[PDB]
Amino acid sequence: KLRRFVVSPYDHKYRIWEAFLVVLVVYTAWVSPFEFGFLRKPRPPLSITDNIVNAFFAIDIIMTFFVGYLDKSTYLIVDDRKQIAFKYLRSWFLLDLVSTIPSEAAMRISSQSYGLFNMLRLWRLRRVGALFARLEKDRNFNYFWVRCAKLVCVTLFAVHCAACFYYLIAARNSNPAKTWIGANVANFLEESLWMRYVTSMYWSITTLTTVGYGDLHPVNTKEMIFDIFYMLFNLGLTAYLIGNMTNLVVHGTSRTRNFRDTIQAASNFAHRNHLPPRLQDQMLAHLCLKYRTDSEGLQQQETLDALPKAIRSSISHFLFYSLMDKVYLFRGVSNDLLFQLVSEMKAEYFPPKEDVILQNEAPTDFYILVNGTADLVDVDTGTESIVREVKAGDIIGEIGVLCYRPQLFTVRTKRLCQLLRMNRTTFLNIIQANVGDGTIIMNNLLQHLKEMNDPVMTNVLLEIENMLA
Amino acid sequence: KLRRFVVSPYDHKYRIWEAFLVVLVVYTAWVSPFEFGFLRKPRPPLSITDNIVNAFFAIDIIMTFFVGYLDKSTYLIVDDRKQIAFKYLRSWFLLDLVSTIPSEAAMRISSQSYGLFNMLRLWRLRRVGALFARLEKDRNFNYFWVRCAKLVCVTLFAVHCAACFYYLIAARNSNPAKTWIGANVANFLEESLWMRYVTSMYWSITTLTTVGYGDLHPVNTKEMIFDIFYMLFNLGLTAYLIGNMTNLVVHGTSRTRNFRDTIQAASNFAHRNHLPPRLQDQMLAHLCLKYRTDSEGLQQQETLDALPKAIRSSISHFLFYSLMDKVYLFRGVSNDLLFQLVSEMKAEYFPPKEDVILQNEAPTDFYILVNGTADLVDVDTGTESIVREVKAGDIIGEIGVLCYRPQLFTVRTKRLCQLLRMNRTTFLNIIQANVGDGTIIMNNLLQHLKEMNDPVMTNVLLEIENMLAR
Amino acid sequence: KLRRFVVSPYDHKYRIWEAFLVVLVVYTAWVSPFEFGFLRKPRPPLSITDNIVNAFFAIDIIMTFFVGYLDKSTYLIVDDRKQIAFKYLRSWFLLDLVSTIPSEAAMRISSQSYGLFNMLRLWRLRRVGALFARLEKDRNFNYFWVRCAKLVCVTLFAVHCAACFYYLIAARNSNPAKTWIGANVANFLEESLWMRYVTSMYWSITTLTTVGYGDLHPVNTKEMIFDIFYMLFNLGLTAYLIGNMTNLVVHGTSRTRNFRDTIQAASNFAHRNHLPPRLQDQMLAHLCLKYRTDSEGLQQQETLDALPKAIRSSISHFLFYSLMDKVYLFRGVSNDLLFQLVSEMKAEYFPPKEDVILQNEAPTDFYILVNGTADLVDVDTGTESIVREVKAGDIIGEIGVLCYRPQLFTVRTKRLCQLLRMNRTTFLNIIQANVGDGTIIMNNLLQHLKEMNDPVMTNVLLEIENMLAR
Amino acid sequence: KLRRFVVSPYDHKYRIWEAFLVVLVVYTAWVSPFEFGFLRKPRPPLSITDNIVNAFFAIDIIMTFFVGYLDKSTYLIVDDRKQIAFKYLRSWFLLDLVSTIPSEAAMRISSQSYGLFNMLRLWRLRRVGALFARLEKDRNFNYFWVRCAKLVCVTLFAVHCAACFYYLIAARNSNPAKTWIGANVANFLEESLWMRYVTSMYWSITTLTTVGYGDLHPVNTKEMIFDIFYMLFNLGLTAYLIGNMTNLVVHGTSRTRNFRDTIQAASNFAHRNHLPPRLQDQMLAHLCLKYRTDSEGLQQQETLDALPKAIRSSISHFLFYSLMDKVYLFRGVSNDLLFQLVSEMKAEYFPPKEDVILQNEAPTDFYILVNGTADLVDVDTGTESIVREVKAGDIIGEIGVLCYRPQLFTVRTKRLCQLLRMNRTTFLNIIQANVGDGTIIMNNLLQHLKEMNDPVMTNVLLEIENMLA
Ligand SMILES: [K+]
Ligand SMILES: [K+]
Ligand SMILES: [K+]
């Protein structure tokens, strides 16, 4: 909400009027050069429908005294009346007023101004450029076709205004039979205005595209000099289009590059030894997944790190705080302190049949599995049978990090599973803050090892109570 | 496994039929625009061979009722004679139908709508579109060398239909002598269709490739306007080709200019340290070999590098088990033990006349020969003294690691070999975990020690019967 | 500091002289080829303004004896005339000398060697190549643009000298009517040098750009051969421009199409978790801000994080110390920890109207407000009663983060603010290692709580009097 | 050494003869199309100097019977003559022979073969392609100029053989005044051979570059059809050159591109806040070293990752084994055991003022400093003054890894230093293999503590005697 009698620039009513002036700009982008080159007085069929547009643009220059502008240093939308004006007047108000006087006025001060005056209205093209500069940054718009539509209007405009100048040079020549157009057609000054405009637009397009048939070409020095600069412009413009379409091509298929070679090199190597298909599908299943889970990890990690911990601690508080109470070890801890743990649990992804935590782990971190099924196995004499199959809700690596011993087992994954992480020194640093809970997680830690009837890991239970001793 | 009287889209005969239809589609892509331009009423030598193609496409638009379609929702061939029919009839049945009426019919409703009508049967180009779409997502075909063939086809097609349209503009004109072609050749209406077609195609390709000799060019506004749009099209099209062949080139050279980047780094590293030249070459003799055989696909270790040890060993076992079972050392042991023994070995190739394990050295590793051949040789009073050669499928330096005697004889690779490596430590930290079986290894070589009967070959007896008393 | 009567090449009064000699080089880059082609003997309007430029280059010939030069092995400005001279005299002193003799001298040895002689003084073009060589490594210049500006001058120079050579081939020809220019204009030898120079410059550029209208073209073999090489040169040159403009474009758009990859990833990530739309709002309100302000250069944290915490802290102390010493609770404490207390704070910008710390929230953090303004407001009875606003240079949420009471109020950023964060833990594990200074914080808070005279703000009085009881 | 009367393909005396035939190939690459196009019988001034080349190539046919070839499957140089022949005779011997017969022979077979026969010699062009394929993947040659030289010869060849065909079409026309060349030159069939060759070479070059002046252009149907295919070839060829020069440009500034942005982002941010130049360069004097080190570290790791251990263990055994006897801890260990440690000591680089190992860290690894000056510090309640400084030959992290204790001190790098590395479990699995040495490295570090005289040093020795318990 803003002050009375002020419209915000982001209003939808407004932004649907702004996009309507752009079609009026494409209109003057055509008519202004065409009048400059082909006309000398405001003839009716175009004077009428040009004083109209000079009202829709007069309406606008007053309708930006009631339009707030987003301040930049404070990102506030200014709605101070006497401050909007002083910014307008200081920036554009002069031009936008000058480029709206009807041509019939400038005619009265000097008959020789119709052409040049109407060329001032090309100042309105600043709205087209401001529009394109916004669409590329938008996300609901294909960056390809937006970058292509801007290349089209640029080259359609240069082709058109060049044709209008190069005809002007021939029209205001002293005697016309020595012009570039007077060479072919005898009396081009009597031909229809549609023929003349098509001819010059056709010379212009075949010089820009470097076809250069050579039927129409400069004949005297005035024309040769304009052409020298036109042909130079096109050399840069052409190199600019080719450079822009290469970048739209080699940077549109720039990801699938190092994902096909590998898949190729995979089955390539596979068929150099024609090993059975029962595993062909098995490995490529992992090749694609491990490409997925790292893309997902990378994207999530990058967006999560670019946010303040006052907000990122609301995502990691909305995704996990529910299943952070079913963990057997945190049952009974103060509700607030648990918030501090959930705020710091970097969720990592994992492709199936991979080892998250291996035997004799240096005590670094313990995980929490939010979804998927992981299975437990220990190493002994080189034969390893499954121990347990932990699924969503339980904790693994939980002991060795607490009692500062090497981790006792090794966890593997069966499906692509997502796991939380918790470095030891952080989780350790958190408890010494609120020590009023640091005892509670210790007993229900122990009550865990007693609620289980496993004999050889309750072995790992008695030597810790002499650690208590 | 589909119901009777239904054909799977993945059948073999069906795919050869589809390719046949694509060939016919190319035929119509040439002939439909050509009739629009250069012909006015169906004359025999084409009015026959197009009715034939119409018959074939009618056959297809009827037998596409007996073809099942996959579904991203299930990835399953939906073989029911109701959903198939209602997918076809709904999607584009009537288009493929209307693009099959013989022109000898449309002539009987309006003698004018002949060229424009049989211009309708360019709708068949959807089949070429689909063919290229499938060829892209494949792996026996170079993706860029297909994105490029699709561009040469679209280029040829544009060059062709532009020529036909332009000649049509010229022919329909009232006064023939004010046309682009009537300016050069006087009675262009009395020349062979061959000459007129070649002339117009000649103008068309000259303008598209921006040569523009200027002998043939527009003469009136009707032609200038067509040409304004043709030249605009080409500007975008050639900008699109150059963008696409830049892509093809970047990836065609990526490999050979990656190789020269590692060889560069392998010297920028061996220089900072002033490595001796005797040693600065063995490095490059192994990086050259690595890429020269990396291209072969034999080198392939990346696939194993990107795999978890859980799945990787499952396929490493598939290879070197049928070879390692014959080695005299591990003969007659538990299957589980030697299985993980396979898992902890790494392969490594060796250019010929190298030295994998030279004698009088610390017994650090022992190898398994998988391919190729090498040979033991003694440095006898500083002279080469060859010994028995070792073939593929045996063991090297095994006496050193399991007796800690320094290596007996050096080993030089005769040909380009490829061995399996297991160093002393990682082996010991396996056997002694389950010594219960490790004893079956000790006597195995011992029993093997009396298989050889030679003085120093029997010196292997006393030095293990040293630890009998030691 | 250097010796007497020596100028360092880095002098500022001197760089303005070198740059002056470049706009004189550009003069000879135009005049020397033009005289070769269109002129035969020095005529006044160009014979005087050409000896002038020869003076300013004779001056630089002596005034380069009093200029020190660097040395890659020393990076030092060697200033000893004996060693400076021999560097010049033996490198290219003579070339610069012979390219300064006035043409009125070489005239009086052989009247033929006029136009060819003053093509020698294109050797001065080395100064332009030197100039561009510096604008590369400069950092205040666009660099792709500098790579681009150098091709505009190359392609303008090639277009120019090609026009003067090609006219020379025509002027020297025996019969003038069989020349490329004599075929078009009859008496081309009786036209203004303006007309002839524009014509030949016109041909030269409809060939470089490959337009090739064909009005002016070679007529005899001597011209065809020059043109064969000109058209070959251009093929390489335009292929080199398009390669360089592709480089300029790829790097000019990288930013905008990187910001699009960030926002894209930030929506996919929100989409997989089905995040509530209220929260999907906040993220993109902070990523857009990050790239807009990142564009401003305030966001400057990427450079900050790269350095080691040992040096990174050295800068962070330089900024937020003069701000932090004013905070009330850090009053009168030893300068050691306030330095290390600063180093462990992280900055984070906040778009306006974003609630950074809401009411009755668990006391997790506490901030220091660097730039901007925010204000606390209470959620009472559903009416948002604003309280005194906080300015840039004070502390928020401090009572909660120490007395462990759920947050006193909310805080909404009025404008775009930027704060310093320090959570409860990382702070506490620092003070409790330095308890000897911690009470100085404890009493400062209370003493501060007495200077305030408020009903509930003095509940923090009685609220903490348990801390001395409990 | 190889068998008698056999030359290896790598012999210098031979590879200096192969590079001489290539200039004879560039000779036939010109003469053969020119004879096909402009001559109809072997005139002297070119028949003599063409039977010569057909001797230097006959000689070579003999010589490749005494030239070993690299057996790819075994990378050996084959030597048995009976095998060299059978590979030649089966691959190229026919063509290389059929393209050597002097043109005077084929003349006696049929007068009309002179043109076509001499075009067979273009088979010799296989040597040029084999040469370029070698120069590219060589290292002593600039990859840029090698790919530029290959693009020049291709276009110089297409331009030349197209000119020779397009003249053949005009020479063999029934009446000559209806040709592309007979249009301009009244009677071209009596002009010099140099004028005619320059004309057609000039038409060919304008069409290839798409200039197309239009003075010379197809006049009839056979010419139009040749041109349709020539102009099509050029469209692909031109797109191939532009694509090849973009790749040589945007892929030659590939590092340069990722590096300057970080540098300017520093100083521009530094000038954003105009902090003193004292430390302004100090940080800028680090990003370089940080970059200079990740590159060296990346490349050494890349080229040690590609070699067999039996060789990589000769580099590390040459760079470090000399200074791995001054370490106080390994003084007295058996010699061959020390070899095994030097084998697995991954050497890492480190920019200055960075911390290789930080306080209270679970035992993971201990390093060895080969060069540079590192300094030791400890976090005592946040006031860290240096304890000692270490230089080449001192070990750090030596304690925590050996007694399973959190790390005691924190090492910083007072300059750019290179550091060895040794993970705990690897170092542990090694002594467990030959325990005949574990006792003397276990204890000799204790004397190091008693050779140390610090009161707060033996505090960790103060549980070493119940470490005996
Ligand atoms: K052209
Ligand atoms: K032309
Ligand atoms: K062109």
Answer for the pair A75, C416: CB distance below 8 angstroms, yes or no.
yes
Which residue in B214, B242, B246 is closest to C214 by CB distance? Answer: B214
Which amino acid, one-letter code, is at A157?
F
Q: What is the experimental method?
A: cryo-EM
Which chain C residues are within 8 Å of A235, Cβ to Cβ? 155, 208-209, 238, 241
**How many CB pairs (< 8 A) connect A and B?**
131
B207: nearest CA partner in chain C: C211
Residue C247 touches chain B, beta carbons under 8 Å: no
Query: Considering the domain boundaries, does residue D2 fall inside one?
Result: no
Which of A246, A264, A272, A290 has the most B C-beta neighbours within 10 Å, making it the best mutation to test the interface with B? A246
The CATH number given to whatever domain includes residue B457 is 2.60.120.10
Greatest distance between any 2 Cα atoms in chain A: 116
Gyration radius from chain D CA atoms: 37
Contacts of D183 (CB under 8 A, 6+ apart): D177, D216, D219
Partner A, chain D 374-433, Cβ-Cβ below 8 Å: 424-425
Query: Considering the domain boundaries, does residue C241 fall inside one?
Result: yes
Alpha helices in D303-403 (DSSP H): 309-319, 335-343, 400-403
Chains touching D (3+ CB pairs < 8 Å): A, B, C
Which amino acid, one-letter code, is at C449?
L
Residues B206 and B341 reside in one and the same domain = no
User: What is the spatial distance between Cα C293 and Cα B63, in angstroms, rounded to a whole number?
Assistant: 63
Which residue in B221, B242, B336 is closest to A246 by CB distance? Answer: B242
Residues D356 and D452 reside in one and the same domain = yes
User: What is the spatial distance between Cα C234 and Cα C230, in angstroms, rounded to a whole number?
Assistant: 6
Alpha-carbon separation of residue D332 from D336, D431, D442 (angstroms)? 12, 15, 11
Residues A299 and A328 reside in one and the same domain = no
CA of B209 to the centre of ligand 1 (A): 9
Which tokens sit at A230?
A: 């036109």
Query: Considering the domain boundaries, does residue D46 fall inside one?
Result: yes
CA of A210 to the centre of ligand 3 (A): 4
C318: nearest CA partner in chain D: D275
Alpha carbon D156 to its chain centroid, in Å, reads: 27
- Ligand index nearest the alpha carbon of residue B215: 2
Residues C206 and C271 reside in one and the same domain = no
Query: Are D296 and B272 an interchain contact pair (Cβ–Cβ within 8 Å)?
Result: yes
- Strands A355-357, D76-77: pairing is unpaired
User: What is the spatial distance between Cα A413 and Cα A337, in angstroms, rounded to a whole number?
Assistant: 30
Answer for the pair D68, D11: CB distance below 8 angstroms, yes or no.
no
Q: Answer yes or no: is D403 a known binding residue.
A: yes
User: What is the spatial distance between Cα C229 and Cα D205, in angstroms, rounded to a whole number?
Assistant: 9
Answer for the pair B90, B30: CB distance below 8 angstroms, yes or no.
no
Q: Can you give the length of chain D in residues? A: 469
Alpha carbon C288 to its chain centroid, in Å, reads: 23
Partner D, chain B 28-87, Cβ-Cβ below 8 Å: none
Q: How far is A430 from chain C (nearest CA, A)?
A: 6
Residue C306 touches chain D, beta carbons under 8 Å: yes
Residue B239 touches chain A, beta carbons under 8 Å: yes
Residues D163 and D312 reside in one and the same domain = no
Answer for the pair D346, D421: CB distance below 8 angstroms, yes or no.
yes
Contacts of B247 (CB under 8 A, 6+ apart): A246, A249, A250, A253, B144, B147, D243
The answer to whether the Cα torsion of B455, B458, B460, B462 is positive or negative is: negative
Residues of C marked as binding for a nucleoside 3',5'-cyclic phosphate?
A: 329-450
Return the ∠ at Cα A81 (arms to A75 and A85), rounded to 5°.
90
Which residue in B214, B264, B426 is closest to D139 by CB distance? Answer: B264
Q: Residue D19 is inside which H or E element, if any?
A: helix D12-38
Can you state the angle between helices C144-172 and C221-252, rounded to 10 degrees? 170
- Ligand index nearest the alpha carbon of residue B214: 2
Query: Considering the domain boundaries, does residue C452 fall inside one?
Result: yes
Query: Considering the domain boundaries, does residue C244 fall inside one?
Result: yes
Phi-psi region of B372 (alpha: psi -120 to 50; beta: other; left: phi over 0): left
Query: Considering the domain boundaries, does residue B254 fall inside one?
Result: no
Q: What are phi and psi of C371, to 5 degrees?
A: -130, 135
Answer for the pair C408, C359: CB distance below 8 angstroms, yes or no.
yes
Alpha-carbon separation of residue A21 from A26, A94, A118, A125 (angstroms)? 9, 19, 18, 11
- DSSP state string for B432-448: GGGHHHHHHHHHHHHHH
Contacts of B192 (CB under 8 A, 6+ apart): none
Which chain C residues are within 8 Å of D246, Cβ to Cβ? 242-243, 246-247
Query: Considering the domain boundaries, does residue B3 fall inside one?
Result: no
Q: How far is D182 from chain B (nearest CA, A)?
A: 16
Q: What are phi and psi of C331, to 5 degrees?
A: -80, 130
Which tokens sit at B354?
A: 């190298």
Query: Are B283 and D207 an interchain contact pair (Cβ–Cβ within 8 Å)?
Result: no
| Domain end call among A241, A274, A306 | A306
User: What is the spatial distance between Cα B15 and Cα C264, in angstroms, rounded to a whole number?
Assistant: 40
Domain that includes residue B25, residue range = 12-248
Partner C, chain A 152-191, Cβ-Cβ below 8 Å: none
Residues C160 and C260 reside in one and the same domain = no
Residue B286 touches chain D, beta carbons under 8 Å: yes
Mapping DSSP to helix (H, G, I), strand (E, B) and coil, where does residue B396 land?
strand
Q: Residue A370 is inside which H or E element, if any?
A: strand A367-371
Residues of C marked as binding?
A: 329-450
Alpha helices in D218-349 (DSSP H): 221-250, 254-273, 277-302, 309-319, 335-343
Q: What are phi and psi of D468, to 5 degrees?
A: -65, -25
Q: How far apart are the first and last CA of chain B?
A: 71
Residue B258 touches chain D, beta carbons under 8 Å: no
Residues D171 and D48 reside in one and the same domain = yes
Answer for the pair C146, C44: CB distance below 8 angstroms, yes or no.
no
Residues A182 and A298 reside in one and the same domain = no
Which chain B residues are within 8 Å of A279, Cβ to Cβ? 314-315, 318
Residues C262 and C404 reside in one and the same domain = no
Residue D285 touches chain C, beta carbons under 8 Å: no
User: What is the spatial distance between Cα B427 and Cα B366, in angstroms, rounded to a whole number?
Assistant: 10
Query: Considering the domain boundaries, does residue A394 fall inside one?
Result: yes
Q: How far is B270 from chain D (nearest CA, A)?
A: 9
Q: How far is C337 from chain A (nearest CA, A)?
A: 19
Which chain D residues are within 8 Å of A214, Cβ to Cβ? 214
Which of C148, C425, C429 has the most A C-beta neighbours within 10 Å, making it the best mutation to test the interface with A? C425
Residue C252 touches chain B, beta carbons under 8 Å: no
Q: Answer yes or no: is A196 a known binding residue.
A: no
Q: Answer yes or no: is D306 a known binding residue.
A: no
Comparing CA positions, the residue from B363, B370, B359, B375 lying closest to residue B427 is: B363
Query: Are D433 and B421 an interchain contact pair (Cβ–Cβ within 8 Å)?
Result: no
Query: Are B143 and A262 an interchain contact pair (Cβ–Cβ within 8 Å)?
Result: no
Which tokens sit at C437?
A: 């200074």
Q: Residue C138 is inside which H or E element, if any?
A: none
Alpha-carbon separation of residue B126 from B51, B122, B123, C446 (angstroms)? 20, 9, 6, 81
Residues C282 and C180 reside in one and the same domain = no
CA of A207 to the centre of ligand 3 (A): 9
Mapping DSSP to helix (H, G, I), strand (E, B) and coil, where does residue B371 land?
strand
DSSP state of B1: -
How many helices (H) and strands (E) in chain C? 18, 7
Residue C300 touches chain D, beta carbons under 8 Å: yes
Which of D246, D259, D286, D357 has the most C C-beta neighbours within 10 Å, making it the best mutation to test the interface with C? D246
Q: How far is A127 from chain D (nearest CA, A)?
A: 31
Gyration radius from chain B CA atoms: 37
Which chain C residues are within 8 Å of A244, Cβ to Cβ? 249
CA of B210 to the centre of ligand 2 (A): 9
Residues C373 and C230 reside in one and the same domain = no
Residues D72 and D155 reside in one and the same domain = yes
**How many CB pairs (< 8 A) connect B and D?**
160
Give me the residues paired with residue D349 across strands. Answer: D418
Residue whose structure tokens are 């693994």:
A396
Which tokens sit at D65?
A: 């019977």
Which chain C residues are within 8 Å of B242, Cβ to Cβ? 242
Greatest distance between any 2 Cα atoms in chain C: 119
Total domains, chain A: 3
Mapping DSSP to helix (H, G, I), strand (E, B) and coil, where does residue C385 land?
strand
Query: Are C243 and D241 an interchain contact pair (Cβ–Cβ within 8 Å)?
Result: no
CA atoms within 13 A of residue B184's CA, in its CB half-sphere: 17
User: Reported resolution in A?
Assistant: 2.7
User: What is the spatial distance between Cα A391 and Cα A369, in angstroms, rounded to a whole number?
Assistant: 7
